Design a protein around this motif. Structure first.
Motif, short mmCIF file in Angstrom:
data_model
loop_
_atom_site.label_atom_id
_atom_site.label_comp_id
_atom_site.label_asym_id
_atom_site.label_seq_id
_atom_site.Cartn_x
_atom_site.Cartn_y
_atom_site.Cartn_z
N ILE A 205 119.18 52.93 -49.62
CA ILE A 205 119.52 54.33 -49.40
C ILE A 205 120.92 54.39 -48.81
CG2 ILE A 205 118.76 56.52 -48.41
CD1 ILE A 205 116.01 55.34 -48.05
N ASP A 206 121.72 55.36 -49.26
CA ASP A 206 123.09 55.47 -48.79
C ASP A 206 123.14 56.02 -47.37
OD1 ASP A 206 123.39 54.74 -51.39
OD2 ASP A 206 124.49 56.52 -52.03
N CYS A 207 123.94 55.38 -46.52
CA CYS A 207 124.09 55.80 -45.13
C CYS A 207 125.48 55.39 -44.64
CB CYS A 207 123.01 55.17 -44.24
SG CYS A 207 123.14 55.60 -42.49
N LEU A 208 126.31 56.38 -44.33
CA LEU A 208 127.66 56.10 -43.87
C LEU A 208 127.63 55.56 -42.44
CD1 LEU A 208 129.63 59.19 -45.25
CD2 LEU A 208 129.76 56.81 -46.03
N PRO A 209 128.60 54.70 -42.08
CA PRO A 209 129.67 54.19 -42.94
C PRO A 209 129.31 52.89 -43.66
CG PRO A 209 130.11 53.54 -40.70
CD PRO A 209 128.79 54.28 -40.68
N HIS A 210 128.05 52.49 -43.57
CA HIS A 210 127.62 51.22 -44.16
C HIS A 210 127.52 51.34 -45.68
CE1 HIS A 210 126.28 50.61 -39.96
NE2 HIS A 210 125.75 51.82 -40.10
N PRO A 211 127.79 50.25 -46.40
CA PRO A 211 127.62 50.26 -47.85
C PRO A 211 126.16 50.03 -48.23
CG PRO A 211 128.46 48.15 -47.16
CD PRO A 211 128.38 48.99 -45.92
N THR A 212 125.86 50.31 -49.49
CA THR A 212 124.52 50.16 -50.05
C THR A 212 124.50 48.93 -50.93
OG1 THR A 212 124.13 52.55 -49.97
CG2 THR A 212 122.70 51.24 -51.40
N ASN A 213 123.77 47.90 -50.51
CA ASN A 213 123.66 46.65 -51.25
C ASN A 213 122.27 46.39 -51.82
OD1 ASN A 213 125.98 45.05 -51.75
ND2 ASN A 213 126.17 44.57 -49.56
N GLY A 214 121.22 46.90 -51.17
CA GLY A 214 119.88 46.73 -51.69
C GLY A 214 119.35 45.31 -51.68
N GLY A 215 119.91 44.44 -50.84
CA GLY A 215 119.47 43.07 -50.75
C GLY A 215 120.38 42.06 -51.41
N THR A 216 121.36 42.51 -52.18
CA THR A 216 122.32 41.62 -52.84
C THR A 216 123.61 41.56 -52.03
OG1 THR A 216 123.46 43.25 -54.23
CG2 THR A 216 121.32 42.44 -55.00
N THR A 217 124.41 40.53 -52.32
CA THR A 217 125.71 40.35 -51.69
C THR A 217 126.86 40.77 -52.60
OG1 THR A 217 125.37 38.02 -52.27
CG2 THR A 217 125.17 38.63 -49.94
N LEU A 251 116.75 44.30 -54.26
CA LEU A 251 116.74 45.37 -55.26
C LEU A 251 115.36 46.00 -55.41
CD1 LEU A 251 119.20 44.34 -58.10
CD2 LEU A 251 119.54 45.72 -56.05
N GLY A 252 114.58 46.01 -54.33
CA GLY A 252 113.28 46.66 -54.33
C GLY A 252 112.27 46.06 -55.27
N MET A 253 112.49 44.84 -55.73
CA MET A 253 111.61 44.17 -56.69
C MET A 253 110.83 43.09 -55.95
SD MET A 253 111.20 45.42 -59.53
CE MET A 253 111.69 47.14 -59.44
N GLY A 254 109.72 43.49 -55.33
CA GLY A 254 108.89 42.56 -54.60
C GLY A 254 107.92 43.29 -53.71
N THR A 255 106.97 42.52 -53.17
CA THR A 255 105.95 43.08 -52.29
C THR A 255 105.66 42.20 -51.09
OG1 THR A 255 104.45 42.30 -54.02
CG2 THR A 255 104.71 44.68 -53.77
N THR A 256 106.52 41.22 -50.79
CA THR A 256 106.33 40.34 -49.64
C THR A 256 107.40 40.49 -48.58
OG1 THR A 256 107.49 38.55 -50.80
CG2 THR A 256 105.09 38.64 -51.02
N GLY A 257 108.65 40.68 -48.98
CA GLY A 257 109.77 40.71 -48.06
C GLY A 257 110.66 39.49 -48.11
N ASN A 258 110.44 38.58 -49.05
CA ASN A 258 111.26 37.39 -49.16
C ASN A 258 112.67 37.77 -49.61
OD1 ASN A 258 112.46 34.86 -50.07
ND2 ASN A 258 110.39 34.00 -50.00
N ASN A 259 113.67 37.26 -48.90
CA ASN A 259 115.08 37.50 -49.23
C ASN A 259 115.84 36.20 -48.97
OD1 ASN A 259 117.92 38.43 -49.17
ND2 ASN A 259 116.99 40.46 -49.33
N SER A 327 120.37 57.25 -53.49
CA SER A 327 119.59 56.04 -53.30
C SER A 327 119.70 55.18 -54.55
CB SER A 327 118.12 56.35 -52.99
OG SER A 327 117.51 57.02 -54.07
N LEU A 328 119.17 53.96 -54.46
CA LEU A 328 119.22 53.03 -55.58
C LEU A 328 118.17 53.34 -56.64
CD1 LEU A 328 119.99 49.51 -54.07
CD2 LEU A 328 121.52 51.25 -55.02
N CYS A 329 117.10 54.05 -56.28
CA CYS A 329 115.98 54.30 -57.19
C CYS A 329 115.92 55.75 -57.65
CB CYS A 329 114.67 53.90 -56.53
SG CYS A 329 114.38 54.70 -54.93
N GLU A 330 117.03 56.49 -57.56
CA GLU A 330 117.05 57.85 -58.05
C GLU A 330 116.93 57.87 -59.57
OE1 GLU A 330 120.90 59.79 -57.73
OE2 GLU A 330 121.78 57.92 -56.96
N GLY A 331 116.25 58.89 -60.09
CA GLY A 331 115.98 59.00 -61.50
C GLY A 331 114.70 58.34 -61.96
#
Length: 602
Positions: A205-217, A251-259, A327-331
């Motif tokens: 989810i977008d939140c200033l001033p931080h960027p939106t990465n969704g778990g990726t670098t 990227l919201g693809m999971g159900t455990t929390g592993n990153n 957000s990353l999952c809009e639409g």
């Protein structure tokens, strides 16, 4: 050669429960690494993908089963009966005005919890009104609460790998936001009840001033943020303090929390176990007490699953109730944005602030005006007692551990004895088609939005957990998508007929407690489907059909691990779901203190 089905002409007693789990091997480390390279192979990868797709049974449904229905691309529910005994607030109202009416639904604040705390008493989480009263009665200032939080983050490394609750944190920004909230209390005019309250925002989810990465670098290289999201702009208008971006499954693809990219988040009740995906960091930081509430996206139970495994309240709102813009999952057609809180007052108050449909979803879905449940017990307290709690006996005891089955049944017996609710036996047909229709309904919009970036030579910058599903999602044809939307209409007609006899559907949120993290999976990830199967067993109905579900903590098992209960009500009936869960936590409050807890205000 082919199978024929129907929906309207279907007997209710002719459907039996199928408890066949998606059997798949568990690969970690190098074996997981070589397996991903085998799926991305040209000739070898395409042939292996179809093999796994035919084993579980997803090929029979899509390309070898005739469907009579019409494709339902988005949740299409008819106008429902009005929720009895609520307060209708304006749709076009501001979050400041809605918080004022939300306080009118709560019981009068008892200062016996904050001040004059008895030395011998049980454990309870710090509520939102506990923070707001200490701010107004000059007991503490939001600037001091921020300094105590940042001290915890910079001491235990909660913003640092490899155990980070947050992946984006700015200490000077948190102090600057607490400084502006402090002057509002010193001058004697706070914005609302949320002024000075810290809330964590998920990294999708977008939140200033931080960027939106969704778990990726690398997402910040291709996706920049310039405006706050629809939920952040509402919370920031109420005077809340946005702490930072919470850790999440990639990227919201999971159900455990592993990153395996930023760092996996540990469970506050047991650091050797998982938090639950995909809102891993958003649920642990609330269970640890470091903040009041947090927001998270619920694509495939990504809000209710981690809330149950951590012992907090996670609310999954109706599809379109909360504006998803920014957000990353809009639409998408299954994703929402719901609040995660330590108690129900905090989840209620945050819900009252971010509840707003978008200009597009307003004309399309046509939502009824929002309603707040009268949490006041007096005068009658019979509006909750006159409910039909529908439950599927075969779809209730299919839990890996018998502790959850007995603990959830006690709540149904307590609700039926103390309030007079009736447990009406129900049946949910075609549960296998729901899992197959959901996985393609959520993977297709996620893969499509990431395809121009993956074709840009950045597919190798993803985790092996995401790359495992991206090869499965890239094999879903367009005809398979249309066949899944027709399945969504079938399950929509079943559930809408279920809601004709019952008000909500009570089931445990997950089929297992917090699972222990495999030590080999912390390197590059894992692919244990049997674990993810037990977690997504009861959350897919609210995502594929858009119904409002909740995850109220009911208790713990024999190991002290949290247990959750799911209450899925009628469309746009958040007041009905929140009102019933209010009676649940009264019959089973949170008692055990997590091993990783931090008590601010002292």
């Amino acid at each position: 050669y082919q199978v024929m089905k129907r929906a309207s002409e279907v007997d209710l007693s002719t459907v039996k429960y199928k408890a066949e789990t998606m059997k798949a091997p568990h690969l970690t480390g190098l074996s997981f690494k070589l397996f991903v390279n085998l799926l991305e192979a040209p000739l070898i990868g395409s042939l292996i993908v179809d093999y796994l797709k035919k084993d579980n049974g997803m090929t029979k449904i899509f390309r070898n089963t005739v469907i009579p229905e019409e494709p339902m691309f988005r949740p299409e529910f008819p106008s429902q009966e009005p929720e009895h005994d609520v307060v209708i607030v304006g749709e076009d109202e501001s979050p400041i005005d809605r918080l004022e009416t939300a306080l009118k639904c709560l019981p009068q604040y008892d200062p016996s919890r904050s001040l004059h705390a008895d030395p011998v008493s049980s454990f309870r989480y710090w509520k939102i009104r506990d923070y707001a009263y200490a701010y107004r009665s000059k007991l503490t200032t939001p600037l001091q609460v921020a300094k105590r939080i940042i001290s915890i983050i910079e001491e235990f490394g909660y913003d640092k790998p490899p155990t980070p609750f947050l992946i984006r944190f700015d200490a000077n920004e948190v102090i600057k936001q607490a400084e502006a909230s402090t002057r509002r209390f010193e001058q004697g005019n706070p914005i609302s009840v949320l002024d000075g309250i810290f809330v964590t925002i998920k990294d999708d989810i977008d939140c200033l001033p931080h960027p939106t990465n969704g778990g990726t670098t690398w997402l910040h290289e291709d996706r920049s943020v310039e405006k706050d999201s629809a939920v952040v702009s509402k919370l920031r208008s109420c005077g809340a303090i946005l702490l930072g971006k919470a850790n999440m499954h990639e990227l919201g693809m999971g159900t455990t929390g592993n990153n395996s990219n930023y760092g996996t988040t540990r469970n506050p009740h047991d650091p050797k176990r998982y938090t639950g995906g995909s809102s891993s960091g958003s649920a642990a930081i609330v269970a640890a007490g470091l903040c009041s509430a947090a927001l998270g996206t619920d694509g495939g139970g990504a809000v209710r699953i981690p809330s149950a495994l951590c012992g907090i309240t996670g609310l999954k709102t109706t599809y379109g109730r909360t504006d998803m813009t920014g957000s990353l999952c809009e639409g998408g057609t299954v994703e929402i944005i719901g609040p995660l809180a330590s108690s129900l007052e905090d989840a209620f108050l945050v819900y009252a602030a971010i509840l707003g449909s978008s200009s597009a979803d307003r004309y399309n879905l046509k939502p009824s005006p929002p309603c707040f449940p009268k949490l006041l017990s007096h005068n009658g307290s019979n509006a909750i007692g006159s409910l039909r709690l529908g439950k599927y006996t075969k779809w209730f005891n299919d839990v890996s551990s018998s502790d959850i089955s007995d603990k959830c049944e006690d709540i149904l017996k307590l609700l039926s004895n103390n309030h007079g609710c009736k447990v009406v036996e129900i049946v949910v047909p075609e549960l296998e088609e729901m899992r197959a229709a959901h996985v393609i309904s959520i993977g297709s919009p996620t893969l499509s939005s990431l395809t121009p970036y993956c074709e840009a030579g950045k597919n190798s910058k993803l985790s092996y957990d995401t790359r495992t599903s991206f090869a499965i999602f890239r094999s879903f044809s367009a005809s398979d998508y249309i066949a899944a939307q027709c399945l969504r209409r079938r399950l929509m007609e079943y559930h809408l007929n279920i809601f004709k006899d019952v008000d909500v559907i009570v089931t445990p949120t997950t089929g297992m407690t917090a699972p222990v993290i495999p030590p080999d999976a912390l390197k590059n990830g894992e692919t244990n489907i049997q674990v993810t199967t037990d977690l997504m067993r009861f959350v897919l109905a609210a995502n594929l059909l858009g119904f409002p579900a909740i995850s109220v903590p009911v208790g713990y098992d024999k190991e002290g691990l949290p247990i959750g209960l799911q209450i899925m009500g009628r469309p746009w009936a958040e007041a009905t779901v929140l009102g019933l869960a209010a009676a649940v936590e009264e019959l089973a409050p949170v008692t055990k203190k997590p091993a990783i807890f931090y008590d601010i205000l002292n």
